Short mmCIF file of C-alpha atoms and ligand atoms in Angstrom, two decimals:
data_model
loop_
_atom_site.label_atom_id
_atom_site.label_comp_id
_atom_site.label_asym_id
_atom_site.label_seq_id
_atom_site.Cartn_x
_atom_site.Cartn_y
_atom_site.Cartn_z
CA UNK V 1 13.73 38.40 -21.37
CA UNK V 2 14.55 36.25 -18.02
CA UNK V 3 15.22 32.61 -18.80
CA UNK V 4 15.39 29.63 -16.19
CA UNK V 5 16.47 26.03 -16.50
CA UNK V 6 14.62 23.73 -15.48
CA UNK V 7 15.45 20.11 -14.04
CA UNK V 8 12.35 18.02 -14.29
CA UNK V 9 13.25 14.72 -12.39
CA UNK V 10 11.73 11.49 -11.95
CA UNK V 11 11.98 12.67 -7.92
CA UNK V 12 13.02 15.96 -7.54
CA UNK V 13 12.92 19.08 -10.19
CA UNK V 14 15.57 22.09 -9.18
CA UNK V 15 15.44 25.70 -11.19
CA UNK V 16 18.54 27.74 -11.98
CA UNK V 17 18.99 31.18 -13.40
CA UNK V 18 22.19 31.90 -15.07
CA UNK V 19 23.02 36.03 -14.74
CA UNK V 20 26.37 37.18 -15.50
CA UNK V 21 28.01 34.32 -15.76
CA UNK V 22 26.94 33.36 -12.28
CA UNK V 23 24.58 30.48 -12.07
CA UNK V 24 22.01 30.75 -8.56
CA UNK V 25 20.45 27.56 -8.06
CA UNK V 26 17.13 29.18 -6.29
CA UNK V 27 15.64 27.56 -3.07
CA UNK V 28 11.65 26.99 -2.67
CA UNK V 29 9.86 28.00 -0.08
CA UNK V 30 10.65 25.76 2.85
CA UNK V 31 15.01 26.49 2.03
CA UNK V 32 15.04 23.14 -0.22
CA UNK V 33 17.51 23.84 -3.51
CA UNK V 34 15.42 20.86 -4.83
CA UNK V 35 11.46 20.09 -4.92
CA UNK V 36 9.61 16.31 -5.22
CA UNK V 37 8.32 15.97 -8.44
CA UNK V 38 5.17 15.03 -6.39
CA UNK V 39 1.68 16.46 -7.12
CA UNK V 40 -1.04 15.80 -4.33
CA UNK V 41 -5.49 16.24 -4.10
CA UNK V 42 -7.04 16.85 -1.09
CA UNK V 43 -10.40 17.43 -0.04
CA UNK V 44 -9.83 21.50 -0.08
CA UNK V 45 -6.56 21.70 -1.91
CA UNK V 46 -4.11 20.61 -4.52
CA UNK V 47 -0.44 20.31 -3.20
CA UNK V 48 2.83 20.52 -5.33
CA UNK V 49 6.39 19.51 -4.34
CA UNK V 50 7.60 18.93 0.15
CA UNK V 51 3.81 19.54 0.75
CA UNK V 52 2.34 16.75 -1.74
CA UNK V 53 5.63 14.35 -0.49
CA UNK V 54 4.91 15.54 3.22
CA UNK V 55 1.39 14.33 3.43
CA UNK V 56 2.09 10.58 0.53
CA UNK V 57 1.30 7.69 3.70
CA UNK V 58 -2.12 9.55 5.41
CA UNK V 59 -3.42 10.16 1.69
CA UNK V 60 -1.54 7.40 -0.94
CA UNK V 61 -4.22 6.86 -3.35
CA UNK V 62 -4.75 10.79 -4.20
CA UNK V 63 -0.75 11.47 -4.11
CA UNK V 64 1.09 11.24 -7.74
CA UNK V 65 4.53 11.32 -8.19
CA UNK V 66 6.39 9.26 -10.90
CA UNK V 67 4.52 11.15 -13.98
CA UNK V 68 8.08 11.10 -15.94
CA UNK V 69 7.96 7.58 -15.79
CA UNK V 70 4.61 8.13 -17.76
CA UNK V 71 5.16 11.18 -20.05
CA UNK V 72 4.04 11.15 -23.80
CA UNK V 73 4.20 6.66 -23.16
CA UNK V 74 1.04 5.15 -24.41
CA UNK V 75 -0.61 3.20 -21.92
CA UNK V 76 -0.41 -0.34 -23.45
CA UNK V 77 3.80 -0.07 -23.22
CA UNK V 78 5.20 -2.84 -21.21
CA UNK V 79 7.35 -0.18 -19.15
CA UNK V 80 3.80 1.06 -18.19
CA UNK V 81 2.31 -2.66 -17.26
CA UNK V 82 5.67 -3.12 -15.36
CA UNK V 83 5.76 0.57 -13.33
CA UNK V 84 2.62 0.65 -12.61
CA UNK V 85 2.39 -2.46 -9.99
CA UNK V 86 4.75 0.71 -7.61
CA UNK V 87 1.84 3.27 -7.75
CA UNK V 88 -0.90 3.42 -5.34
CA UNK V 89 -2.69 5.99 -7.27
CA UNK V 90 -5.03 4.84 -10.37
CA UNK V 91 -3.68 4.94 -14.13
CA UNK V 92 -6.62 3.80 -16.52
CA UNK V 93 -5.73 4.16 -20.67
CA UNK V 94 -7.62 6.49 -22.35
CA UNK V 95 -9.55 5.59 -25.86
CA UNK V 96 -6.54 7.88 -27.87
CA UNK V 97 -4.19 5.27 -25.78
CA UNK V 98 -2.89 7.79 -23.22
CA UNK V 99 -2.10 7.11 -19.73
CA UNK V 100 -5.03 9.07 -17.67
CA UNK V 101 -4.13 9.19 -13.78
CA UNK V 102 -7.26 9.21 -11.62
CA UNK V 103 -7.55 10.86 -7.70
CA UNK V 104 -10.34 12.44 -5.61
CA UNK V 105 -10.12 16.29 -5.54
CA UNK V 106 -12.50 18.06 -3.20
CA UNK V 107 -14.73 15.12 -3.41
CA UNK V 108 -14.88 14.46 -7.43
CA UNK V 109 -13.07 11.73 -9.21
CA UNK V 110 -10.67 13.82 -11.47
CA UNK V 111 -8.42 13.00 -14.26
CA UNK V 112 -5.01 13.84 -15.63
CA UNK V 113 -2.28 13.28 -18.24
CA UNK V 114 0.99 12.64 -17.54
CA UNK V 115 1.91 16.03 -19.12
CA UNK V 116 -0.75 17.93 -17.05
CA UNK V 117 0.66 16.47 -13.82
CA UNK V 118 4.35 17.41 -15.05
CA UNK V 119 2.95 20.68 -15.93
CA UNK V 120 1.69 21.31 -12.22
CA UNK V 121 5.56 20.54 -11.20
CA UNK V 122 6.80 22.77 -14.00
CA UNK V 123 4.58 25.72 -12.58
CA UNK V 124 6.26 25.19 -9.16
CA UNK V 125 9.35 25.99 -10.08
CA UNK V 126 8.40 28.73 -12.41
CA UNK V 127 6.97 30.34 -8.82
CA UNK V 128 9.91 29.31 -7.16
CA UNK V 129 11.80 31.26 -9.25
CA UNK V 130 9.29 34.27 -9.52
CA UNK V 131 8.90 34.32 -5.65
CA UNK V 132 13.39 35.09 -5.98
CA UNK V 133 13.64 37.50 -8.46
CA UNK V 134 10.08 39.38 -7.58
CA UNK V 135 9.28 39.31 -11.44
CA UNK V 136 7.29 36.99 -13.92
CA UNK V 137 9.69 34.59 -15.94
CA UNK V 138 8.00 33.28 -19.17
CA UNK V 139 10.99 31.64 -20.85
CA UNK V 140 12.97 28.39 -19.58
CA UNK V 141 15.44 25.65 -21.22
CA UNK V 142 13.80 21.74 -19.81
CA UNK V 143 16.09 19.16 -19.65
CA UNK V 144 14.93 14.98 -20.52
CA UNK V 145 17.27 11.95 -20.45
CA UNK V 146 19.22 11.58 -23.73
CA UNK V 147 17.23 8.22 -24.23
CA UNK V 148 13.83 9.99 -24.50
CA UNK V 149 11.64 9.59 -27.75
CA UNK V 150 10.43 12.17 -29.77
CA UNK V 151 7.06 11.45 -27.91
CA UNK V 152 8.62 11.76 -24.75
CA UNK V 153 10.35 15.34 -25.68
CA UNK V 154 7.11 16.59 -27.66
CA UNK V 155 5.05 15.68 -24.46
CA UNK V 156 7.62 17.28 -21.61
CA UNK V 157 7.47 20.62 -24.26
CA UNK V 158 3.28 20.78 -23.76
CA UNK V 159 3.90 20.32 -20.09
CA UNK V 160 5.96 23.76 -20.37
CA UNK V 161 3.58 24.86 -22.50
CA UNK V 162 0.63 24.36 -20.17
CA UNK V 163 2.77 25.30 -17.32
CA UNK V 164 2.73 29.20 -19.14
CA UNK V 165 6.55 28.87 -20.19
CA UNK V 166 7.68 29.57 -23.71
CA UNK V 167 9.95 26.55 -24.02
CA UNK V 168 13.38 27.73 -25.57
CA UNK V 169 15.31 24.35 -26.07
CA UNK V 170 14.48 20.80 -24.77
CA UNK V 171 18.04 19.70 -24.18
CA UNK V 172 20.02 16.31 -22.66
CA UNK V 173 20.56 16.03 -19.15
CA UNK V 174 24.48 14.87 -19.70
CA UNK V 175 24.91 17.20 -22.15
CA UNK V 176 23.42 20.20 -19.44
CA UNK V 177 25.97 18.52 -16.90
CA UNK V 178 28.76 19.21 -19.17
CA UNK V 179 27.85 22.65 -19.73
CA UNK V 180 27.22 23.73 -15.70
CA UNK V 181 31.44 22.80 -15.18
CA UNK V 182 32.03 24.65 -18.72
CA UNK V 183 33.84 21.67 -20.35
CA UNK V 184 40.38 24.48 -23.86
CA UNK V 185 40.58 19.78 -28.66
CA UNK V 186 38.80 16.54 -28.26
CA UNK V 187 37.32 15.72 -24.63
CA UNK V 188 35.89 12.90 -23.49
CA UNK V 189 33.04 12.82 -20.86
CA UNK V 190 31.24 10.69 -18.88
CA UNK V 191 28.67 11.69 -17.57
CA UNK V 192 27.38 9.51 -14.26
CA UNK V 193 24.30 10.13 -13.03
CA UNK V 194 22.25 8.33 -10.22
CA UNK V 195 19.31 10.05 -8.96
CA UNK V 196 16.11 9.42 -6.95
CA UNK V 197 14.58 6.96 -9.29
CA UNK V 198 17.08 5.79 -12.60
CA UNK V 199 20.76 5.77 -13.18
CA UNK V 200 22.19 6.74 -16.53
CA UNK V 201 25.57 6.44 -17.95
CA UNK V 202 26.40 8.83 -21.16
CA UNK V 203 29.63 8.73 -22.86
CA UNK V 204 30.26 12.20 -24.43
CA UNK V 205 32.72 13.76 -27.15
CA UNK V 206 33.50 18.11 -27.14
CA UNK V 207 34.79 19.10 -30.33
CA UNK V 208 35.26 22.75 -31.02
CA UNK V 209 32.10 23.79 -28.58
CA UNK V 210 30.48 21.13 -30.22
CA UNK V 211 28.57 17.82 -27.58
CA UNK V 212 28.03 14.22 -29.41
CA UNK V 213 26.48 11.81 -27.30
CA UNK V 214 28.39 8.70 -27.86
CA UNK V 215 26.65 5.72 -25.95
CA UNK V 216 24.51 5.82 -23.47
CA UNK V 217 23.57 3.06 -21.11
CA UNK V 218 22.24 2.52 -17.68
CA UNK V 219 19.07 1.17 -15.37
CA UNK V 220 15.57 3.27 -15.32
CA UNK V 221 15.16 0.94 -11.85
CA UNK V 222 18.64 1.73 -10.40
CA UNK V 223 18.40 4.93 -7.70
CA UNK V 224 18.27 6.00 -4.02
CA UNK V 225 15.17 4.80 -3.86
CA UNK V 226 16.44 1.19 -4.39
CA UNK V 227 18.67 1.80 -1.46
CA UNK V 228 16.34 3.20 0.76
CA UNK V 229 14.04 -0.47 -0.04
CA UNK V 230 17.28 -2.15 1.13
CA UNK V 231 17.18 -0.24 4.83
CA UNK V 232 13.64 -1.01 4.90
CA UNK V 233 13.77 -4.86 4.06
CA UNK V 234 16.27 -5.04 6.67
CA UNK V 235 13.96 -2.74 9.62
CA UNK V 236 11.06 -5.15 8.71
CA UNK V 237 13.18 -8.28 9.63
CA UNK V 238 14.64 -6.28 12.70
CA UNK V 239 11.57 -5.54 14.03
CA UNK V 240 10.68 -9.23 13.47
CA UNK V 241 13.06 -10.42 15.59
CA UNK V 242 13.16 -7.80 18.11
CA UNK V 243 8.93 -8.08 18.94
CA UNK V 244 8.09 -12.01 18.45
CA UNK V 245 7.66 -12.08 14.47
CA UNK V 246 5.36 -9.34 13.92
CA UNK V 247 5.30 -8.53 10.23
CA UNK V 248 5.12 -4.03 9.55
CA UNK V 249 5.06 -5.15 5.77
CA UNK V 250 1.35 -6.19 6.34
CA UNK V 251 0.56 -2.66 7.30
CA UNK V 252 1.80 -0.16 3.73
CA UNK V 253 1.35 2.89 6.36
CA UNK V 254 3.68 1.42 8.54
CA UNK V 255 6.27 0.82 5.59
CA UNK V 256 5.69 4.10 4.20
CA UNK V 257 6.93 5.96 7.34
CA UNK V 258 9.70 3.14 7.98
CA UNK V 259 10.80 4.58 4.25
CA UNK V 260 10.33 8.05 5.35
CA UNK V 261 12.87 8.03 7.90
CA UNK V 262 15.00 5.09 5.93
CA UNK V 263 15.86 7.38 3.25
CA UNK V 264 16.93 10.44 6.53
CA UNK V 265 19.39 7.79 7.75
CA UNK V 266 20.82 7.00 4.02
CA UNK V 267 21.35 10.59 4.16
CA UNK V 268 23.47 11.07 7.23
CA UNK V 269 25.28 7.81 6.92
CA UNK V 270 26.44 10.46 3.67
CA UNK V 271 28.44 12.30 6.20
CA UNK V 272 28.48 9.78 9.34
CA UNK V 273 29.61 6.58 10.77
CA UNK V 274 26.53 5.91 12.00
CA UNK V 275 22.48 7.13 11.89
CA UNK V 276 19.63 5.75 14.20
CA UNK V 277 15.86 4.92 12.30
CA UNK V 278 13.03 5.92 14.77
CA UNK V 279 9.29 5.22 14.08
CA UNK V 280 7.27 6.10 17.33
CA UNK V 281 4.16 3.75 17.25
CA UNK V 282 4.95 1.89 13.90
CA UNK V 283 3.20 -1.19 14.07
CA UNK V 284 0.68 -2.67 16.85
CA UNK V 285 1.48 0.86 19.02
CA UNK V 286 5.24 -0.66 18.98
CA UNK V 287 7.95 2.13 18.86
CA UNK V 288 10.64 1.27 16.97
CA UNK V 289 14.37 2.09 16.65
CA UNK V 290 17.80 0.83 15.31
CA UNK V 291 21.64 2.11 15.06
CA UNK V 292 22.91 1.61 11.19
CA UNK V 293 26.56 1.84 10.64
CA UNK V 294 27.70 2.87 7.22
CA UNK V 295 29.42 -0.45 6.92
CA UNK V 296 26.22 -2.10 7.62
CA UNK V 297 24.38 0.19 4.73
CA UNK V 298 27.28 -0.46 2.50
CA UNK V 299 26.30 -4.15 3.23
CA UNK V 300 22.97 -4.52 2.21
CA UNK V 301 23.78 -2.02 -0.80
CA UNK V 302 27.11 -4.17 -2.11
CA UNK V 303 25.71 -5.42 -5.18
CA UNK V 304 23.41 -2.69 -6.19
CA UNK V 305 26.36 -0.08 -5.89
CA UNK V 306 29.14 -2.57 -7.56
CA UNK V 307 26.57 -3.14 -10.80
CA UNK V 308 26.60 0.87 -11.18
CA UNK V 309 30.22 0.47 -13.04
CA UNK V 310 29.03 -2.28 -15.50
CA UNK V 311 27.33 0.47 -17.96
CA UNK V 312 30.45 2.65 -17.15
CA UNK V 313 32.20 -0.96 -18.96
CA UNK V 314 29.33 -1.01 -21.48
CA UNK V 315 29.41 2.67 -22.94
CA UNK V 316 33.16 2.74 -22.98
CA UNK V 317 32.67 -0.64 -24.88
CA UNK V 318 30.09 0.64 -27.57
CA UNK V 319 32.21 3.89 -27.96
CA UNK V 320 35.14 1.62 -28.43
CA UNK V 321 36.91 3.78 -26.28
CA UNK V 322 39.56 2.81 -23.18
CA UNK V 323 38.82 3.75 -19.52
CA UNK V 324 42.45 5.70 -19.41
CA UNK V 325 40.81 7.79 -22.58
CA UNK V 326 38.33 9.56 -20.34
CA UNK V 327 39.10 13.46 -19.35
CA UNK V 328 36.35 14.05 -17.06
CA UNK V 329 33.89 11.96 -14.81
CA UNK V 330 31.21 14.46 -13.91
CA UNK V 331 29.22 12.85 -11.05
CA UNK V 332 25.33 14.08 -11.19
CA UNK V 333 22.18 13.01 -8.98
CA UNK V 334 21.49 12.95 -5.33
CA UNK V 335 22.88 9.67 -4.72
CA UNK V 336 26.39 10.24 -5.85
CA UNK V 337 26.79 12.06 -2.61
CA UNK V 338 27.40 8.11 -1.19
CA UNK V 339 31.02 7.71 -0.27
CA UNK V 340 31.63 4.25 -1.22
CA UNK V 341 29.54 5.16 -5.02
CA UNK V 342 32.45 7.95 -4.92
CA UNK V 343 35.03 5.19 -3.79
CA UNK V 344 34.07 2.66 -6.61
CA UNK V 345 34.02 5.03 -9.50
CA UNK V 346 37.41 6.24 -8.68
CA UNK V 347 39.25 3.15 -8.38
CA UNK V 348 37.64 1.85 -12.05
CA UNK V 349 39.13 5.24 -13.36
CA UNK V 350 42.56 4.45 -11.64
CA UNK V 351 42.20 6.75 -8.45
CA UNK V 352 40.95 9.99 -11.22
CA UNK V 353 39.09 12.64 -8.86
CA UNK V 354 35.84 12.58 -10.73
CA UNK V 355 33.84 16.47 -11.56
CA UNK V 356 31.96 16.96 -8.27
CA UNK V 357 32.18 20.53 -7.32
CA UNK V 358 28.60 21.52 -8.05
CA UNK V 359 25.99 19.50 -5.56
CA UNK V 360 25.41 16.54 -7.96
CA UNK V 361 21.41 16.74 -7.75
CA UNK V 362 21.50 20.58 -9.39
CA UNK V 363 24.10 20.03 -11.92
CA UNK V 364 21.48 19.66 -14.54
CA UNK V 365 19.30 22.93 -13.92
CA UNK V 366 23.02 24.33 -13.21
CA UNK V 367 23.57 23.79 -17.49
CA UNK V 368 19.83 24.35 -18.54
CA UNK V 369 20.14 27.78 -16.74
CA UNK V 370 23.73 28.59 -18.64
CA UNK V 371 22.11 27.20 -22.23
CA UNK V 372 18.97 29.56 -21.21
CA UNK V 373 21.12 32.34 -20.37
CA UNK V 374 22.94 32.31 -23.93
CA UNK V 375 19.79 31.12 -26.02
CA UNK V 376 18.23 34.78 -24.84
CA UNK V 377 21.31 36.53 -26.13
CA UNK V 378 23.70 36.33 -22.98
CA UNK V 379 26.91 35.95 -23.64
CA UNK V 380 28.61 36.26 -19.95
CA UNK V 381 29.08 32.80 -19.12
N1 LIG E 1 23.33 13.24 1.02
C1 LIG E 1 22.74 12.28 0.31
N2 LIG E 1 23.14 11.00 0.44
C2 LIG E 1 22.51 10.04 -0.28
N3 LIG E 1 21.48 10.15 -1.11
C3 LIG E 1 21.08 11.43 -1.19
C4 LIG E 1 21.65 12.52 -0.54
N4 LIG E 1 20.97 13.69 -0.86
C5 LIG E 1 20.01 13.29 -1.67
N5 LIG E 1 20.05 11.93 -1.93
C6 LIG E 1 19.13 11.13 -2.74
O1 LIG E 1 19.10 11.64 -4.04
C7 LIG E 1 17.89 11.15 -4.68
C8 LIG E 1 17.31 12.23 -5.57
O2 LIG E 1 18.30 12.54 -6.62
P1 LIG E 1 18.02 13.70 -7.67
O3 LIG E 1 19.23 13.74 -8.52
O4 LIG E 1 17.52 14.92 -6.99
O5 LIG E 1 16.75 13.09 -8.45
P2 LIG E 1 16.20 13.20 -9.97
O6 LIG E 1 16.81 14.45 -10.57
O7 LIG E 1 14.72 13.19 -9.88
N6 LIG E 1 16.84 11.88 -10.67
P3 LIG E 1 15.93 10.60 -11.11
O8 LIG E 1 15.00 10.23 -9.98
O9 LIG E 1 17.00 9.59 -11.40
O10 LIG E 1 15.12 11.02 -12.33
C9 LIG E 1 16.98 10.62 -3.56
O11 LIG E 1 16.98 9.21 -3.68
C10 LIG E 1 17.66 11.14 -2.29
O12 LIG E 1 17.49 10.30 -1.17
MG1 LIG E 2 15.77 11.33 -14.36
#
């Protein structure tokens, strides 16, 4: 009888469970409200979420993550030829065509479909949510971008299948936004969503109860992780000049934890002037460290965060439809926490307050956990 929803991100998954109308997004076991959609092998043990992400630069090649970008694709796709050059784990095609991602587990080569590594994800959060409420949950609503194929839905379904859920609903992740802020005749919504990995733009129409997805548009390339590259390129040239052009890009375990602690400083500059980046022995037994203003962030990010609004222009376009004809701008993701993101999307609306009230990076599971909630026979929300 207890259904969760389920965000499965390209970076981070989050579980809600929707119980009298109230909606608890439920925190794993280290206090996170979200968990990285990042599946590790060891030689004694396989590790799922902060653990697997905890442990990526001392074991890269046996660390997956990125399994979305893979999910029910065949392996001969030029997204997959293109992705795959950011992976330091193996993906070899299969002779049915599928993607088959190889890793060392307790000393054997072992492989895995996309599904089965999204399944592994999909199980952590089922426990996450078990662990909370102290009972079993068999039954969840999974969200996918509105752009995914039939493939890519059929294929995120057998990872909740596999997983042990009995998969309600595979629904949108704008259309989920729109339902977590409960969104009186004829709205319309877009829906702005930058996460870890992609950023997607979905225009929306509510008729009597009733979501159309208009136009959709966006940038699977476009995310925080983009912006944490940006702190990174700029360290790497820091350090240059600060130690007699010594290059840390030479050394991938040196850029891995320069990224670690780039993306902690993108963080605070969310809610500070300033944030330092410290790596203690990064390259050559060199310690490094460096102030970043928020100006100076906003800097190296200008372009990258001024593109965001040009497939605002280009669903608004397709749906033939005027900025000044939008009634709500629901920001979703992780990175729409960034002030100046905030900033620019408000002046293009004309100084509108955009939707913001629920953190932006649980908004989804916020709406899959209200659609489970009333697909089991709930009608509190
Ligand atoms: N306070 C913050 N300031 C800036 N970025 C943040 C903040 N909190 C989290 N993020 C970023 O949010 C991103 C993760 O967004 P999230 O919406 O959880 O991912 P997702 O659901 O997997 N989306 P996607 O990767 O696009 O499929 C990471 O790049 C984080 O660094
Ligand atoms: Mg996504």
């Amino acid at each position: 009888e207890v259904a969760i929803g389920i965000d499965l991100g390209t970076t981070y998954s989050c579980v809600g469970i929707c119980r009298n109308g109230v909606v608890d997004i439920i925190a794993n076991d280290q206090g996170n409200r979200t968990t990285p959609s990042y599946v590790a092998f060891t030689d004694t043990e396989r590790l799922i979420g902060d653990a697997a992400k905890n442990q990526a630069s001392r074991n890269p090649e046996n660390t997956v993550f990125d399994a979305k970008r893979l999910i029910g694709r065949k392996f001969s796709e030029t997204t997959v030829q293109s992705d795959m050059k950011h992976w330091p784990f193996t993906v070899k095609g299969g002779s049915d065509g599928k993607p088959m991602i190889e890793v060392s587990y307790q000393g054997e080569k072992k492989t895995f479909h996309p599904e089965e590594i999204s399944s592994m994800v999909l199980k952590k959060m089922k426990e996450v949510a078990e662990t909370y409420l102290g009972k079993p949950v068999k039954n969840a609503v999974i969200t996918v971008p509105a752009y995914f194929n039939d493939s890519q839905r059929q294929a995120t379904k057998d990872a909740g299948a596999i997983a042990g859920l009995n998969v309600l609903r595979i629904i949108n992740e704008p259309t989920a936004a729109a339902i977590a802020y409960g969104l009186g005749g004829e709205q319309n919504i877009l829906i702005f969503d930058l996460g870890g990995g992609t950023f997607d733009v979905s225009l929306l129409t509510l008729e009597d109860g009733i979501f159309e997805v208009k136009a959709t548009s966006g940038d699977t390339h476009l995310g925080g992780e983009d912006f944490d590259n940006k702190l990174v390129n700029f360290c790497v040239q820091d350090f240059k000049k600060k130690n007699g052009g010594k290059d840390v890009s030479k050394n991938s375990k040196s850029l891995r934890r320069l990224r670690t602690q780039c993306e902690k400083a993108k963080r605070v500059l969310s809610s500070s002037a300033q944030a330092t980046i410290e790596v203690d022995s990064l390259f050559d037994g060199i310690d490094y460290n460096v102030n970043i203003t928020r100006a100076k962030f906003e800097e190296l990010c200008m372009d990258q965060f001024r593109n965001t609004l040009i497939p605002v222009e280009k669903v608004l376009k397709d749906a033939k439809m005027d900025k000044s004809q939008v009634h709500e701008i629901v920001l979703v993701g992780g990175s729409t926490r960034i002030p100046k993101i905030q900033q620019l999307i408000k002046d293009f609306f004309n100084g509108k307050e955009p939707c913001k009230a629920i953190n932006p990076d649980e908004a989804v599971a916020y709406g899959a956990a209200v659609q489970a909630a009333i697909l089991s026979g709930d009608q509190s929300s």
